[PDB]
Amino acid sequence: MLKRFPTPILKVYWPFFVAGAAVYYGMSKAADLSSNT
Amino acid sequence: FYFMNQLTYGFLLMITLLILFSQFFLPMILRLYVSRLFISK
Amino acid sequence: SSGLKLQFALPHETLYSGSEVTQVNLPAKSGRIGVLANHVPTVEQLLPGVVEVMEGSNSKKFFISGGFATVQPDSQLCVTAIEAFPLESFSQENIKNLLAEAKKNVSSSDAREAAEAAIQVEVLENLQSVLK
Amino acid sequence: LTTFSLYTIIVLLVITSLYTLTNNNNKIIGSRWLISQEAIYDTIMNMTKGQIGGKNWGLYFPMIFTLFMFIFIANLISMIPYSFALSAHLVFIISLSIVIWLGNTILGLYKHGWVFFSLFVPAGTPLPLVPLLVIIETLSYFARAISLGLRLGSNILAGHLLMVILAGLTFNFMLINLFTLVFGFVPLAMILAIMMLEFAIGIIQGYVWAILTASYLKDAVYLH
Amino acid sequence: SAWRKAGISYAAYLNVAAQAIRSSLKTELQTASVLNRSQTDAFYTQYKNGTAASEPTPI
Amino acid sequence: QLVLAAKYIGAGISTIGLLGAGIGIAIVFAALINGVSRNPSIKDTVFPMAILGFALSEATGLFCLMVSFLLLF
Amino acid sequence: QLVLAAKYIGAGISTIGLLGAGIGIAIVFAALINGVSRNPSIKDTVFPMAILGFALSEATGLFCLMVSFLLLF
Amino acid sequence: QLVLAAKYIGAGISTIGLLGAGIGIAIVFAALINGVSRNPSIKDTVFPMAILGFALSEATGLFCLMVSFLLLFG
Amino acid sequence: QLVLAAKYIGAGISTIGLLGAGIGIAIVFAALINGVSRNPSIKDTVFPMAILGFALSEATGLFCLMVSFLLLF
Amino acid sequence: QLVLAAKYIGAGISTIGLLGAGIGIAIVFAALINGVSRNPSIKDTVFPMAILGFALSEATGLFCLMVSFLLLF
Amino acid sequence: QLVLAAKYIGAGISTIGLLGAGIGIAIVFAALINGVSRNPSIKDTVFPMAILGFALSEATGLFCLMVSFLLLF
Amino acid sequence: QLVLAAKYIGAGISTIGLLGAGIGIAIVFAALINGVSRNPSIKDTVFPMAILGFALSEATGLFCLMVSFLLLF
Amino acid sequence: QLVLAAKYIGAGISTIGLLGAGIGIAIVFAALINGVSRNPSIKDTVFPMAILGFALSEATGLFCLMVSFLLLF
Amino acid sequence: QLVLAAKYIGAGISTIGLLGAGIGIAIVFAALINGVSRNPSIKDTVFPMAILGFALSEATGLFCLMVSFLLLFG
Amino acid sequence: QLVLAAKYIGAGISTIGLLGAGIGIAIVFAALINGVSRNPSIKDTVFPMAILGFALSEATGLFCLMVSFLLLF
Structure with missing residues (x-):
């Protein structure tokens, strides 16, 4: 039934993930600086 | 207030679905269609 | 091919065959079809008007009483008219005033006959109009 | 414990089950229930290879098949008597919008790189007119996030919270009055209309979200 | 003009226009074939299922 | 007070953008209807695009x- | 007070947005009429796909x- | 007071809300009439649709x- | 006072709704004119129906x- | 005061409402222009029905x- | 004051009421342009009615x- | 003050009226352009009429x- | 205060143009739908252009x- | 004060008149594009004056x- | 104060004027879409005209x- 095929998203979906990490970091910073809440 | 309570807690599923479905969900339809192609040849 | 070709070959006697031109402005059924060059893929049934086929030389004007000018993508205007007309023989006074009125006698026929001849009611006016 | 974990738990329990349990034994025949996936996935692939056509079709088509269902499932909590698609807050679209836009700029910067200045002017407007065109290209790139961010979100939020207004106002359509008859019973019929509206709007908005994502991605993945 | 309502067909309208336009002209233009265009001797008798060619009215 | x-x-004033959106959506529906009438066959290749625009x-x-609503509550 | x-x-102001629904509700019928005239055949399929848009x-x-209503009660 | x-x-301001139903029926009648001229065989079908569209x-x-009116009398 | x-x-503002009728009866009569020009005969069933639309x-x-007028007095 | x-x-406000005449004239006027464009021979009976529309x-x-004027006095 | x-x-409020005419006259003008593109044989007679339309x-x-102006001076 | x-x-309110002209002149210009494209002969018989319509x-x-201009002074 | x-x-005043934006965008989608129903082969040359415009x-x-938004917070 | x-x-409100400018720009550009579609050899024919009409x-x-601008100025 | x-x-009220451009870019997009549908080869020539219109x-x-924004900042 269920398998785990070799899905390449490590070298394929790396850029979006990196951008999302930067976005989460910016959100954390705005949780303390821009929004100050 | 409540900002660091659903941001990562929500996007966790978004990050995981890439490894989840791609080896899990679309694999089923892809293998089924390929096998049906094999019967077609 | 550059320019614009016209195929004016009526069921009586073919006049033009793919000759180059600068304008072939004609009175279409929905309006005035001033296709000068190239035109676009669209062919229209025509209304009695003037087809001043502007060749590389002067635009010959001939009051033409109908047709369809197929604007083929090759700048070819296939004007399969029903009648031919000169730039001089299609211009007269008495022949364009008494003939239609005498035909108005035919309009005194029954309903379907009058419905047919209603076209002829204004047919001759177009030639005298476009004769200039 | 935490309410957010319980909110995400429905997704964590449905995503694996609908494909590992709805199918009978992972059979190729396509069950009557499994006809749902049998119809959905093929239409998904149609757009995926279509809208992202070229060698860029296989670059992230699986990412599309993934990202499409997340918002659609998260907004599925709209028709319950206490329905909540992300507790009426749902900051999630913010996560998926600007980050994806920056990913498009990266696909122009990581793969396309320094050629990134050769896409904002699709046709013309050279140095004599480039800045005006760039002035609206920038707006388009900026607002592509908001076009898929909070747009389906606002649609879902309104289609769900309209029930709150409906209850609060027409609590007394027929409960205790002489107006319980045919006189005012038509006002209570708007709730099911709101339900149908939310149900269609959510699915259509998820599909539109996927389409807008593909449209933005292929624009920065194939420079003209 | 009135081909829309109760005529015969587009060919009928353009042909009547041809007849009038030729009438809007003298002998110096109207060739001999214009005479047959005016003198149409085609006799139309629509047949039937039982081969009933009713009457060969000139077309 | x-x-x-x-x-x-402010909410009442900002809540007047409904009419133009409704007009546009009706326009999209009208064009879909026209394309269906003129082109009965290809209607499927646009109905998906039709819903895409309607949404x-x-x-x-x-x-x-x-x-x-953000000003309403 | x-x-x-x-x-x-504000309720009256928000009510003035009904013009969009009004214009669209008959633009749909206009599309239906245009279909019926241009394609009397396709109008049958159109009515199911036009009445919904009108709704x-x-x-x-x-x-x-x-x-x-939220501003009037 | x-x-x-x-x-x-507010009633006067909301008195602009029916303009859409105004020109709307206008466009409806417009298309119905133009089509009826385009095809008299659709005249019967238009009216059974024209009435429903207008109402x-x-x-x-x-x-x-x-x-x-609720803000006028009620 | x-x-x-x-x-x-409010009476002055409520007078704004005359614009819609002015455009609308105009659209109906405009369609009557266009249809008569395109199809002269159908004016018999149109002009009466044109009056109905005007109504x-x-x-x-x-x-x-x-x-x-009720609000002004 | x-x-x-x-x-x-309010007299100033209602005056914008007169703009509806701008479309009231325009619709019938374009109808006549188009009708003469299509069947100029119908120009005789065109204004015959366009007059009631203009009125x-x-x-x-x-x-x-x-x-x-009721308000202005 | x-x-x-x-x-x-009020005078300023009325001062955009010219929108109706500013659109309707342009409508009649484009209508005449379309007529000339369509029935160019009647442009001169159209102008004798196009002027009336513009007016x-x-x-x-x-x-x-x-x-x-009644409230502007 | x-x-x-x-x-x-009131000056600002009158000022937005330039919209009517910005649409009206553009409409006539566009109509003449389309007429010339769909009738090359119409350019010579409409261009002075085109400028007149822009006016x-x-x-x-x-x-x-x-x-x-008066209000400011 | x-x-x-x-x-x-002010935030109630900005949000009116969204009506016009919806009208324009849905009109663009409508035109893409109709043009495709006209030339099914025109999908490749059309759909990208309208996706660029209506967005x-x-x-x-x-x-x-x-x-x-900004005046709102 | x-x-x-x-x-x-008033400076803010008068800026609503930009809608007419936008619609006029639309009319000119769109009808020029259509005229270019119908008679492709009319592009040069109308470029000398159509751009002027847009202007x-x-x-x-x-x-x-x-x-x-004068309102922000004097 | x-x-x-x-x-x-005023800053809030200024947002109405962009509605014309927002609908109009889509209008030009619609006309280009229809033109390509009639003539795909005109897409290349109109794209320069498309930039001309969009700008x-x-x-x-x-x-x-x-x-x-400037009058606010």
């Missing part, structure tokens, strides 16, 4: 309602 | 109704 | 004017 | 005018 | 301006 | 500007 | 700007 | 709502 | 904007 | 938003 009613007035409008229409 | 009547005025059109005024 | 002024002004369109104008 | 001033201003359209401006 | 002031302001189209400005 | 500024406000359209702009 | 307040606010459309907008 | 009230008033049409309204 | 306040408010519609919006 | 209030009100259209909305 005026400060509170200010939000009510592409109605989403902003409801976005107007939401922006009014 | 100073806010309730202002809410009434979908009314949602524009439905938002107007809801906004006015 | 100002409630009366606000209700009158349904004007229903929204009626709702908007009822909103004003 | 404010009530009469408000009645006058269904200008009634909107009539209702707006009646409401405005 | 209240009631007369509101009479003046009913300026009639919107007429009724709105009658209300306007 | 209380009621005079009121006349100023009957700009009549709305005149009626609006006069009412504006 | 109130005098200058009105002489600025016939911009007149309302000049009227609109005129009131602001 | 007046500044906050006026910020609310910007709706983005104009979203940025217009951004005007209400 | 209040006079400058109303100057600011005229745009100068109308310029006259719409100049009032606000 | 009003100049800030009126600046906020002359979106500038009105862009400067509108810039001026709206």
Whole structure:
């Protein structure tokens, strides 16, 4: 039934993930600086 | 207030679905269609 | 091919065959079809008007009483008219005033006959109009 | 414990089950229930290879098949008597919008790189007119996030919270009055209309979200 | 003009226009074939299922 | 007293973007109908695009309602 | 006092968005008529796909109704 | 006291809501007439659709004017 | 003293609805003209139906005018 | 300085309502222009039916301006 | 200055009522242009009616500007 | 301040009237362009008429700007 | 407190253009739908252009709502 | 003070007239595009004057904007 | 405590004018779409005209938003 095929998203979906990490970091910073809440 | 309570807690599923479905969900339809192609040849 | 070709070959006697031109402005059924060059893929049934086929030389004007000018993508205007007309023989006074009125006698026929001849009611006016 | 974990738990329990349990034994025949996936996935692939056509079709088509269902499932909590698609807050679209836009700029910067200045002017407007065109290209790139961010979100939020207004106002359509008859019973019929509206709007908005994502991605993945 | 309502067909309208336009002209233009265009001797008798060619009215 | 009613007035004013969105959505529906009549066959190749546009409008229409709600509550 | 009547005025203002639903509700019928004239055949399939839009059109005024009601009660 | 002024002004402002039902029925009749000229064989079909389009369109104008009337008498 | 001033201003504003009727009866008659030019004969069933449409359209401006007159007095 | 002031302001406001005559004239005028463009021979009976439309189209400005004079005095 | 500024406000409010004519006259103008592209044989006779159309359209702009000026001077 | 307040606010209200001209002149220009494209012979018989129509459309907008020019002074 | 009230008033004023943005975008989608029903082969040359245009049409309204956004917080 | 306040408010409000400029720009550009589609050899034929017509519609919006510019100025 | 209030009100009210450009870019997009549907080869020639139209259209909305924000900042 269920398998785990070799899905390449490590070298394929790396850029979006990196951008999302930067976005989460910016959100954390705005949780303390821009929004100050 | 409540900002660091659903941001990562929500996007966790978004990050995981890439490894989840791609080896899990679309694999089923892809293998089924390929096998049906094999019967077609 | 550059320019614009016209195929004016009526069921009586073919006049033009793919000759180059600068304008072939004609009175279409929905309006005035001033296709000068190239035109676009669209062919229209025509209304009695003037087809001043502007060749590389002067635009010959001939009051033409109908047709369809197929604007083929090759700048070819296939004007399969029903009648031919000169730039001089299609211009007269008495022949364009008494003939239609005498035909108005035919309009005194029954309903379907009058419905047919209603076209002829204004047919001759177009030639005298476009004769200039 | 935490309410957010319980909110995400429905997704964590449905995503694996609908494909590992709805199918009978992972059979190729396509069950009557499994006809749902049998119809959905093929239409998904149609757009995926279509809208992202070229060698860029296989670059992230699986990412599309993934990202499409997340918002659609998260907004599925709209028709319950206490329905909540992300507790009426749902900051999630913010996560998926600007980050994806920056990913498009990266696909122009990581793969396309320094050629990134050769896409904002699709046709013309050279140095004599480039800045005006760039002035609206920038707006388009900026607002592509908001076009898929909070747009389906606002649609879902309104289609769900309209029930709150409906209850609060027409609590007394027929409960205790002489107006319980045919006189005012038509006002209570708007709730099911709101339900149908939310149900269609959510699915259509998820599909539109996927389409807008593909449209933005292929624009920065194939420079003209 | 009135081909829309109760005529015969587009060919009928353009042909009547041809007849009038030729009438809007003298002998110096109207060739001999214009005479047959005016003198149409085609006799139309629509047949039937039982081969009933009713009457060969000139077309 | 005026400060509170200010939000009510602002929401009422911002809540007038419904009409144009409705007009546009009806326009999209009308063009779909026209394409169906003129081109009965190819209707399927556009009905998906038709819903794509219908939503592409109605989403902003409801976005107007939401922006009014942000002042409404 | 100073806010309730202002809410009434805001309800009236939000009600003025009914023009979109009104214009669309008959633009749909216009499309249906155009289809019937141009394609009398396809009009049969169109009516099922046009009546829904006409109903979908009314949602524009439905938002107007809801906004006015929240500002009028 | 100002409630009366606000209700009158709100009714007057909402008195622009029926314009859409106004020109809407206009466009409906326009297409019906143009098509009827295009094909008299669709004249019978248009009216059984024209009436439904006109009434349904004007229903929204009626709702908007009822909103004003509630602010006018009620 | 404010009530009469408000009645006058609201009456002036409620007069805006005459625009819709002016355009609408115009659209109906415009369609009658276009259809008569394109199809002369159908004027017999159109001009009566054109009057019916005029009745269904200008009634909107009539209702707006009646409401405005009621508010002005 | 209240009631007369509101009479003046509302008179100014209702005057924009006269703009509906701008479309009231335009629709029938374009209809006649197009009708002559299609069947110029119908220009004789075109104004025969366009006259009633013009009368009913300026009639919107007429009724709105009658209300306007009712307010102006 | 209380009621005079009121006349100023009303006059400014009327001052965009020329929109109806500013669209309707352009409508008749484009209609004549389309007619010339269609029935070019009647452009001269159309202008003898196109002038009347432009006037009957700009009549709305005149009626609006006069009412504006009544409170502008 | 109130005098200058009105002489600025009503000025701005009259100022938006340039929209009517910006649409009206563009419509005539576009109509002449399309007529020339769909009738190359119509350019010579319409271009002076095109400029005349541009004038016939911009007149309302000049009227609109005129009131602001007077109001400011 | 007046500044906050006026910020609310302004944020209620910006959100009206979203109606026009929806109208324009859905009209663009409508035109793509109709043109495709006309030339099915024209899909490749059409759909990208309209996806570029209508997205910007709706983005104009979203940025217009951004005007209400900043004054809202 | 209040006079400058109303100057600011009117400067904001008059900016609504940009809609007519936008619609005129649409009309000119769109109909020029259509004319180019119908007669492709009309592009050069109309470029000398159609661009001028777009400039005229745009100068109308310029006259719409100049009032606000003086409002921020004097 | 009003100049800030009126600046906020005017800045909010300025967002209406971009609606024309927002609908109009889509209008030009629709015309280009139909032109390509009739003639795909005209897409290349019109894309220069497409830039010409888009630049002359979106500038009105862009400067509108810039001026709206500038009077606030």
